[PDB]
Amino acid sequence: LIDRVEEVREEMDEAQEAARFLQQHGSALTKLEPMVAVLQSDPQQHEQL
Amino acid sequence: WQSARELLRDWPSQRHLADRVQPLRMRLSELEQRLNNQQNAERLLSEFCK
Amino acid sequence: WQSARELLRDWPSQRHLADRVQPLRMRLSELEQRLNNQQNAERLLSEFCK
Structure with missing residues (x-):
């Protein structure tokens, strides 16, 4: 009474969604990863800093 | 910054x-x-039992 | 720096x-x-077939 076909199907859903999300935002994530640190500094806040 | 870090944490996974x-x-x-x-x-088991 | 980045990229995996x-x-x-x-x-196949 293993009933693991449902668990394997949930793993497929998560993995197919991860693959679909990778196709949807891979270009955005690859362009964001080399300059992520800039997000900690906002133009007006630099004067207050 | 935190959301970008969280995305870059989840994306490799x-x-x-x-x-x-x-x-x-x-x-x-x-x-x-x-x-x-x-x-x-x-x-087949349940069928033969009777 | 590059090795630390590569190590932190490996850690999720x-x-x-x-x-x-x-x-x-x-x-x-x-x-x-x-x-x-x-x-x-x-x-069993080999013993019967012999």
Whole structure:
């Protein structure tokens, strides 16, 4: 009474969604990863800093 | 900044598990064929019991 | 810096693949019984055929 076909199907859903999300935002994530640190500094806040 | 960090934390995991769709497809195919055989044996057992 | 970045890129994958242990233990136990039955069937076939 293993009933693991449902668990394997949930793993497929998560993995197919991860693959679909990778196709949807891979270009955005690859362009964001080399300059992520800039997000900690906002133009007006630099004067207050 | 925190959301970008969280995305860059999740994205490597998404890339790592995305390749498993095919291994999961063969795993589920064998497992569902196995469950059909389990159901057949349970039916044939219950049928003979009486 | 590049090695620290590569190491922090490996860490997500290292955890996700380390989590694969328990699912593989059940797979190993099942596959071991399959080999046992394959050898029983091959032996019984060879003895009867002799």
